[PDB]
Design a protein around this nucleic acid. Structure first.
Lengths: 103, 50, 51
RNA sequence: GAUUGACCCUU
RNA sequence: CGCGGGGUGGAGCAGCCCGGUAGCUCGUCGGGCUGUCAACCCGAAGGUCGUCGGUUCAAAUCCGGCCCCCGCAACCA
RNA sequence: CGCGGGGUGGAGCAGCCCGGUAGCUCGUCGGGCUAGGAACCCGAAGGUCGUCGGUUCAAAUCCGGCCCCCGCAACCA
RNA sequence: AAGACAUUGUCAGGUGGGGAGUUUGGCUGGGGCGGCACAUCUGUUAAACGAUAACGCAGAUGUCCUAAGGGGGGCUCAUGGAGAACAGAAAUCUCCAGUAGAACAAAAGGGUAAAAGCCCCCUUGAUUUUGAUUUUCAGUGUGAAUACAAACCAUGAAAGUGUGGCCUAUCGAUCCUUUAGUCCCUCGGAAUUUGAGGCUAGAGGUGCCAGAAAAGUUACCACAGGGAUAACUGGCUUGUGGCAGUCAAGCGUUCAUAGCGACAUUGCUUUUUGAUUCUUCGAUGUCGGCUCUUCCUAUCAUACCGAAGCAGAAUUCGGUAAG
RNA sequence: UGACAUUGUGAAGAGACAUAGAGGGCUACCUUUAUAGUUUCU
RNA sequence: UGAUUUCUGCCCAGUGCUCUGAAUGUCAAAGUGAAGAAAUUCAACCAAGCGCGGGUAAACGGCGGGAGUAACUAUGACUC
RNA sequence: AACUGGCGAUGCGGGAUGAACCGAACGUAGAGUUAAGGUGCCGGAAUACACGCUCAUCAGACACCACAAAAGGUGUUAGUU
RNA sequence: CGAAUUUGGGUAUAGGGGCGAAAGACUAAUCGAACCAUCUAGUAGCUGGUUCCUGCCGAAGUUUCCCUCAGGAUAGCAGAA
């Protein structure tokens, strides 16, 4: 699936509050930091004796993840998030579809 | 010829070792049964040669 | 499983050596003064079987 | 001192 | 678990650590010495180096999204 | 007597998922040295597809009036 | 001898079935193997409201699409006929018919003609906030969808249309992490500031799809049970096995029926084997043989008969007949 | 197996932090000199 | 493995065992260097192991299928 | 698996017997009348009345239900040209 | 049946231990982990039992979810107020 890198869309920036131009990127998960309360609790629980104390998931079934576009407004630099459906192939680079062509 | 409770080699429906009989030097008591830290095995064509 | 025979051989209960018939430890003369500065003459009294 | 192996028919 | 030199023929290969684009056998196309018979020696099919951007003297060689190969059994939402 | 393989030309018979009437099988006027001879083609076929029919794409097989086993009933606890 | 090295203490990384603790799905014409009827969608079963089962039948889903979304405009499709020069049944094809026999991402069913199809122009409503509603439903969730409100936009001349795909499937809790937003609240003796914790919306996933973190073997075995459930008998059924009819195309040199008998078709206790799972799992002792009694007749022999393709002998087909 | 402690006293070589001189037409990994915060093993 | 006798064939690809380190590899704690005001965040590397590479079957174990070759039907010593 | 009615959970009269069929549902008694089913005897109740059919050297005998078929017969009875 | 013989007494080995010319054999009639006491009245969606009378009312084996299928929650059916 091909999504353009720009989009006119509503921005709730309190300065725009209207449809404005947004640059479009793919959202990256972000590194799971230490010192987050959940990781701190997990490390404290895992310290000592007793083995693995919480569950580790194994029965993976999904073959695709939902893609999240990040819309950064070019006017006020407000960011928005929006997810698409599940797709195996996702492309941001615009190479448009051409009808009157051969192959 | 023992049961699996009695030896690493015991058990089976045929009398066979099952896994390799060459045991690591880093093995433990109860594991070190067989050929401990063997560099080679089988019949050797040679003499001691001091 | 179970403790195997070569493991059991280390507790030394029935696997200690049968030392009743033995004639003593076979050791050299102690290295006192004569063995390192001169010599000392002894006599072979008997030659015996050690079990 | 290399690699040259083979060759269906009569006195 | 931000995946390791690597994708070079119908079947196998590294040449490259500052710029010369190209080959070893078989299955082949053809040529003869020995008089002639496999081996014996010489040119050719698959290489546009898997859409792409960079150096306007040289991107198959060095990087950045990807595709059925995976032992990095490497503190694993 | 298993919805399963067969009666595959004179033997021996491999493709069996469309018969210009060869589904494959040494010789015989003749291809270069003809010194007779020594590998390969045809003017010779006892399948006129095991036989009476035509729902007959030219059928005479994929329907039937004859026999058995190449992984043929291992079942009884 | 040896020497600040071994040793010893602590921490850290390997190795470690030698040992420890656990686990090793469900449905199911027993269980296992297979399959998924486990979350779903289309048509039928399904018996003209709705609902409705089976490991019923024919299939499909875990995707795909910046257009294959939204608006406007123009045009009309499949096919058949007469057609050009190579050129042909299947290029290039001008007219005439053409109710859709085309196409609409995919399965099926519905739907669609100055369109929902095919071209062209513009575009990002596949946007924001939160509610209400329909389906499954407990009227819980999830998924999907419907009609508005308040905005901001696209398109068109406009009316209007658009809150993703013509409709019916295409999917995901808590906890944790992570991103976006106010830069809003808190770190509890006042706070530069960093860090952390909250508020609202997404994403990382549980396909056993309301979502455990999980390998075997036991013929050495154990316990709680189960006739809710298999391995005998018995019971219903009789596909299959066995036996018996009806009709006669033919065989029997002639000649359907002495003896047979195809293609069909009607049946008979269960001596087969299945199918089922009603009884029995706080146990009905199991294969065969030996032994012994009895019963059935669908009669091998013996008694007496009928009929022959019965000259005689030997046979064959039948009747009463189980003494 | 590593680190730290037990643990105390002396010896040649290998990395940066040349401020600088040996190389090839708006220039490559590159052998090598004062070694006065530094290195462990042979 | 199981007295004598006679022999004990081929295979180190796999699993295991073993062995130098030739190693753009992976690589903990401690230690070090950038930053930060600091908690902290980033970078190499002498560890062992795992990799790589060699050896080893009287270690565990394994010892197939094709294509072509000749005149009873086969038929393959031979070549891939 | 169907709109249902029942058994389970329910006795009673009948189907000889039977969870489910038919009749009918239940306090303790007494008279009358019935349902379903029956009236030769067992057994309460007509060896009633009326018209036929049937004779079986395996008759038949009343639903659920405890079975019989195709094909036949100058057995006998009744029915078109 | 002259020895890898048989046996008395003493002695050693103790339970995930011993001992085993190996059968999971033997370890006080107990062995694929002995016996004793305790934790412990261990847990059991499973089996069994569950004690007086009369009166009135009176079901369900279905829905949804559940490692859910011999169980439960939920709705339904029922009682009581």
């Amino acid at each position: 699936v091909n999504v353009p890198k720009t989009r006119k869309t509503y921005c709730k920036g309190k300065t725009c509050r209207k449809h404005t131009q947004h640059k479009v990127t793919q959202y990256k998960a972000g590194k799971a930091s230490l010192f987050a309360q959940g990781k701190r609790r997990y490390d404290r629980k895992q310290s000592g004796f007793g083995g693995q104390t919480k569950p580790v998931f194994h029965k993976k079934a999904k073959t695709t993840k939902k893609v999240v576009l990040r819309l950064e407004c070019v006017k006020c630099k407000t960011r928005a998030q929006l997810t698409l459906k599940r797709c195996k192939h996702f492309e941001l680079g615009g190479e448009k579809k051409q009808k009157g062509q051969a192959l | 010829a023992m049961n699996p409770v009695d030896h690493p080699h015991g058990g089976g429906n045929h009398q066979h070792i099952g896994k390799a009989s060459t045991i690591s030097r880093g093995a433990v008591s109860g594991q070190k049964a067989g050929l401990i830290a063997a560099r080679r095995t089988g019949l050797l064509r040679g003499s001691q040669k001091t | 499983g179970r403790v195997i025979r070569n493991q059991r051989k280390g507790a030394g209960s029935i696997f200690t050596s049968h030392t009743r018939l033995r004639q003593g430890a076979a050791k050299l003369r102690t290295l006192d003064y004569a063995e390192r500065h001169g010599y000392i003459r002894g006599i072979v009294k008997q030659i015996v079987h050690d079990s």
